[PDB]
Amino acid sequence: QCVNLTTRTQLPPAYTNSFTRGVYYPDKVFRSSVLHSTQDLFLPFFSNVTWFHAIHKRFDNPVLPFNDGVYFASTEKSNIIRGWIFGTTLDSKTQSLLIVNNATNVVIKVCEFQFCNDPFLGVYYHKNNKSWMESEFRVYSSANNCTFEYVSQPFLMDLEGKQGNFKNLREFVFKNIDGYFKIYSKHTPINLVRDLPQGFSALEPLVDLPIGINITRFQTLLALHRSYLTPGDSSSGWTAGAAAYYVGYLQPRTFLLKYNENGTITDAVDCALDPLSETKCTLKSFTVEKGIYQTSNFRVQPTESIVRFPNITNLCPFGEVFNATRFASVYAWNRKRISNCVADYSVLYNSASFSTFKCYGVSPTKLNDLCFTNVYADSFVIRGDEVRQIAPGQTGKIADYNYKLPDDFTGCVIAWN
């Protein structure tokens, strides 16, 4: 559960370049032999994505911010990648989305899971029936409050260690849209020595997860190796195969999706990448002819918002009213009309010079930004037990017989010792 790996070593988050990845179908709508323009959370082309790899003395399982969405890409031989953990705290404090492929089927669950230092899945002691079926469940210790569960079709996962170049390529897309989580996937063989292949790919939806939870961080799960001959301390002495997984960030960008006769995308263009791409976006075409075209308009954004209001002087003496030598009786309460002046309420409400202060129908903060039509001040002195009677819809010796506030009273009551 919480046992740290012996050979794990931290490495700096090195970066790389992505050529044409980050493209996926925004919706199930079908289109063919057309160039469609759409804006959604996308990974910009030629962007920077993290450089992570798994070996027997550097194990990569860092916590990465999710933000509005991320992109995944990895080159595999034995499919070392196991799954992911999605959530805000990645702990039982809140719900976390987790996807685990434990060699029989893809399992998606939304519950309150207990966080672990190094969550993952592995297998041990295979011997003469290759197996590679999930053995231990370190992903989480306990679960509760499950609001969603899903199961995919059964299948067998091949974790055989293979020599040569990387024969497999897996790329997924993870995004949140008003709490709606969408998953895209793509699988294609490759012959790769290092880094990523030069080419284009299109990712298709995997499942639909209308969950509706806030996710700000996520983890990448890895599959390690175990054997009868070279085991280790539980569970620090376990090792995993060779793999490299890369994580990107999605941004609200507009792409020109070029659809073939069968509807598959063969090309993509990002407006913000290249001014030539800006020309293509403006023309809504994948070909640009020799010439000068107007794509958009440039503008200089304000540095900061500057407010210069006129002098607020000539204030009516509210302080004198509150500090006047004498006040009228509760029955003889004076009705003071205030107009033809400015009111500075910052010194009154926020000075904390009075015992109690409350407002009805409007918060004191909003009153500072509002312009009124008529303002009246009613000054009176009453006993402590009678202060509670000053409110809309009250009764008593003061509320009914001396001074009554209407149920729709939008003013405020001020009192002090």
Next chain:
Amino acid sequence: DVLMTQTPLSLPVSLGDQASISCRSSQSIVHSNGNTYLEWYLQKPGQSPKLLIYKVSNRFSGVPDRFSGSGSGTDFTLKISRVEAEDLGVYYCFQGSHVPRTFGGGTKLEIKRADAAPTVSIFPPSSEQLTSGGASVVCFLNNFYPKDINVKWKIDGSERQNGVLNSWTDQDSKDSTYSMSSTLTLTKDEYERHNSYTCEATHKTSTSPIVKSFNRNEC
């Protein structure tokens, strides 16, 4: 599910001799890396099994260097360079790794020495037992080798097999003698209904079983 068989059931070895215990498995336990999956357990008298060898090729920590295994495939053999007095017990084979673990039939070990014949002594039931309503004819067979031995109960010349109990002792520490007793459970009416009782000790060293008898009216 894997079936495991062992042979021989038991074997005697004098102090200093070598012991050979072999185990058979219905499925191959060797894999690509070349090593083997098997553990040898020894259960001492009055004690639980203890590990002896792991992988068949590596000795467990704290085990005497005399214990060592060898073999390949599904056939293996445990070899003891010099068997001492503390090796008495039952040898077992174990299948490890990740699979429903299998156990062996067991193999007992004993020290070899000169043969001896049993001493047959037969005791009538006590008077108190007859007062209680029960009866038990007890026959003692002690100081005999090997462990193989049998007892036959006869009533007035008629054999009765029901109610016959036999218990075998562990190897002794001084004479290494094996002792056994034959208890014939009988009711008061059955015991008093018959007069002659005979206990015959069938043993390898003697073609004619040693016979001891007594008379109820004389006891």
Next chain:
Amino acid sequence: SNNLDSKVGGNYNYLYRLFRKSNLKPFERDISTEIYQAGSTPCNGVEGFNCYFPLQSYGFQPTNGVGYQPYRVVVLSFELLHAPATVCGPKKSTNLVKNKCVNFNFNGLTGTGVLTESNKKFLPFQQFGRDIADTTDAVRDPQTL
């Protein structure tokens, strides 16, 4: 729901947020109990002057007036033709027709056109097709794909 929700003087099972530090966004639920700070003096997470507890209780009562009595509110939100149809009204369906002009209602898509077998191949997740003009081009049969 006055006959059910109202209890004696009030019902603490139903509460509301009296104050918030800013304006709310669409379709977001704020459960934070942070004290709303009205003034410049830090509230220190406790009630006080210019410091009020946003969560408040209703004044539901069996004797309350029409305006003050509790009214259970249910709001319906949905997306039309933005994804595969998971729900549908109790409207009886009929057999499919081909090579004839008919008024079709497929997965909520109402329109007029000729139905014919399509030579275009859709991806298994793709259901609705669009033409160059973005109008109705082709769709997938919900029952017999």
Next chain:
Amino acid sequence: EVQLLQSGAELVRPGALVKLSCKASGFNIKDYYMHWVKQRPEQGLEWFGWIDPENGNTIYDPKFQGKASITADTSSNTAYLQLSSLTSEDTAVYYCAGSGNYEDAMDYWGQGTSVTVSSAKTTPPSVYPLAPGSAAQTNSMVTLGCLVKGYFPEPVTVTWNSGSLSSGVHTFPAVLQSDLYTLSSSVTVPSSTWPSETVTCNVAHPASSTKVDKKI
């Protein structure tokens, strides 16, 4: 030094359940596997299952599948075993092993626990002296015996002269028949001891706290 500790013995009626504990000492329970084993006299050992306290996954012998569940405790450093719907066929001795460190080369075993599943109740032993038969049987030496029958549960210890006479004393392990135990003992002495000197056999039944002295 590591040691695995278990209860000495247990007794329950058919259809009941037994909860067994295997204590861990000198090693980490979480990081090391825990095994279980059952032993009966006739055909030896029978495997039961294994459990990982860190993980909790359990596998059972196809014979015992659906018959029992395994659990472990982290704070107490003790592994638990539970059997349900017990019957007469479940009488056997149970053992626990562990301290594997994810490796076969490392393991231990406890003293074990004797579990008997029967409808009988504790029965104090009936001790009777065994005198020789007819005088026609004679020898330069004489043999004596002590009879123990109709007692339950085990163990029951029998000795001679409170263990002061270790010469020619043979102890015979008990045998189980019809939910009852029966053991016998014998002492070898010369003709100059008995009847010239008294010979006594002492029988102790800790379960029933029964002590009997019988002179022959």
